[PDB]
Amino acid sequence: HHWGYGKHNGPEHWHKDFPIAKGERQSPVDIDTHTAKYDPSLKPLSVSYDQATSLRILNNGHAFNVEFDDSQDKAVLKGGPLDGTYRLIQFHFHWGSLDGQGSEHTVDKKKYAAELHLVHWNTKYGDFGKAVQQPDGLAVLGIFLKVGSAKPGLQKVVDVLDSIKTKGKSADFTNFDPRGLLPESLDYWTYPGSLTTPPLLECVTWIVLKEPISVSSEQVLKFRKLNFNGEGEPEELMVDNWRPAQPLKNRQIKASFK
Ligand SMILES: [Zn+2]
């Protein structure tokens, strides 16, 4: 027994093992575009992924992560509302069983087909494990996916999914360029929050891009063929691995654009 997205162990049950689930800065949240405050003091985002070194792709039972070498400042995120350098460690997605759901954050209550999270940790803390224990330890870049035209830069990920169908399976995944997953504009919303999966630590500075990227129905369909279960166990399709919106509470969402 453990946490998951089922009916008996889903998000509504998490608070029993992880009390922080009912915390003051939980994520995701609904972004109300008319309540969001334009902050002219926000600097443009600085994404430097030219030297990125991807290593592996893993199905961890609740999603699939594409891991990167974070032993040096290769792929970093700076600027925006951040102070210091944040290193890319991995990226993963959240998706639904239908195109009408899948994203964790919503915009004016609108749900997207999926949501991409590029996770980075503040280098002043030494390692990822120490970073999560700090209020400014992580910076997560969130990108919405809508169904439409295919995204060429996403196909390499899609094609390797059959090799990591079940929990615990991993595959060599080198030379992948995450720049192919970025939208044209880097306009964003930002607010203080947390990880959206246990341990739900409140150590994240969220940076959600306004512009979604388009992926084809065939691409997102291949995500839905993954399994929550491990090999040799009853097959449970990996779908609807998203946490619903949490109360905003004493927080303000800021926008880098008007
Ligand atoms: Zn995530």
Swiss-Prot record:
<dbReference type="GO" id="GO:0045177">
    <property type="term" value="C:apical part of cell"/>
</dbReference>
<dbReference type="InterPro" id="IPR018338">
    <property type="entry name" value="Carbonic_anhydrase_a-class_CS"/>
</dbReference>
<feature type="site" description="Fine-tunes the proton-transfer properties of H-64; involved in the binding of some activators, including histamine and L-histidine">
    <location>
        <position position="65"/>
    </location>
</feature>
<dbReference type="GO" id="GO:0005886">
    <property type="term" value="C:plasma membrane"/>
</dbReference>
<dbReference type="GO" id="GO:0004089">
    <property type="term" value="F:carbonate dehydratase activity"/>
</dbReference>
<dbReference type="GO" id="GO:0002009">
    <property type="term" value="P:morphogenesis of an epithelium"/>
</dbReference>
<dbReference type="InterPro" id="IPR036398">
    <property type="entry name" value="CA_dom_sf"/>
</dbReference>
<dbReference type="GO" id="GO:0018820">
    <property type="term" value="F:cyanamide hydratase activity"/>
</dbReference>
<feature type="site" description="Fine-tunes the proton-transfer properties of H-64">
    <location>
        <position position="5"/>
    </location>
</feature>
<dbReference type="GO" id="GO:0043209">
    <property type="term" value="C:myelin sheath"/>
</dbReference>
<dbReference type="GO" id="GO:0046903">
    <property type="term" value="P:secretion"/>
</dbReference>
<keyword id="KW-0963">Cytoplasm</keyword>
<keyword id="KW-0987">Osteopetrosis</keyword>
<dbReference type="GO" id="GO:0004064">
    <property type="term" value="F:arylesterase activity"/>
</dbReference>
<dbReference type="GO" id="GO:0005737">
    <property type="term" value="C:cytoplasm"/>
</dbReference>
<dbReference type="GO" id="GO:0070062">
    <property type="term" value="C:extracellular exosome"/>
</dbReference>
<keyword id="KW-0007">Acetylation</keyword>
<dbReference type="GO" id="GO:0032849">
    <property type="term" value="P:positive regulation of cellular pH reduction"/>
</dbReference>
<keyword id="KW-0597">Phosphoprotein</keyword>
<dbReference type="GO" id="GO:0044070">
    <property type="term" value="P:regulation of monoatomic anion transport"/>
</dbReference>
<feature type="binding site">
    <location>
        <position position="94"/>
    </location>
    <ligand>
        <name>Zn(2+)</name>
    </ligand>
</feature>
<dbReference type="Pfam" id="PF00194">
    <property type="entry name" value="Carb_anhydrase"/>
</dbReference>
<feature type="active site" description="Proton donor/acceptor">
    <location>
        <position position="62"/>
    </location>
</feature>
<feature type="modified residue" description="Phosphoserine">
    <location>
        <position position="163"/>
    </location>
</feature>
<feature type="site" description="Involved in the binding of some activators, including histamine and L-histidine">
    <location>
        <position position="90"/>
    </location>
</feature>
<keyword id="KW-0225">Disease variant</keyword>
<dbReference type="GO" id="GO:0051453">
    <property type="term" value="P:regulation of intracellular pH"/>
</dbReference>
<keyword id="KW-0479">Metal-binding</keyword>
<dbReference type="GO" id="GO:0015670">
    <property type="term" value="P:carbon dioxide transport"/>
</dbReference>
<dbReference type="InterPro" id="IPR001148">
    <property type="entry name" value="CA_dom"/>
</dbReference>
<dbReference type="GO" id="GO:0008270">
    <property type="term" value="F:zinc ion binding"/>
</dbReference>
<feature type="domain" description="Alpha-carbonic anhydrase">
    <location>
        <begin position="1"/>
        <end position="257"/>
    </location>
</feature>
<keyword id="KW-0472">Membrane</keyword>
<protein>
    <recommendedName>
        <fullName>Carbonic anhydrase 2</fullName>
        <ecNumber>4.2.1.1</ecNumber>
        <ecNumber>4.2.1.69</ecNumber>
    </recommendedName>
</protein>
<dbReference type="GO" id="GO:0070050">
    <property type="term" value="P:neuron cellular homeostasis"/>
</dbReference>
<keyword id="KW-1003">Cell membrane</keyword>
<dbReference type="GO" id="GO:0005829">
    <property type="term" value="C:cytosol"/>
</dbReference>
<feature type="binding site">
    <location>
        <position position="92"/>
    </location>
    <ligand>
        <name>Zn(2+)</name>
    </ligand>
</feature>
<dbReference type="GO" id="GO:0032230">
    <property type="term" value="P:positive regulation of synaptic transmission, GABAergic"/>
</dbReference>
<feature type="modified residue" description="Phosphoserine">
    <location>
        <position position="170"/>
    </location>
</feature>
<keyword id="KW-0456">Lyase</keyword>
<comment type="subunit">
    <text>Interacts with SLC4A4. Interaction with SLC4A7 regulates SLC4A7 transporter activity. Interacts with SLC26A6 isoform 4 (via C-terminus cytoplasmic domain).</text>
</comment>
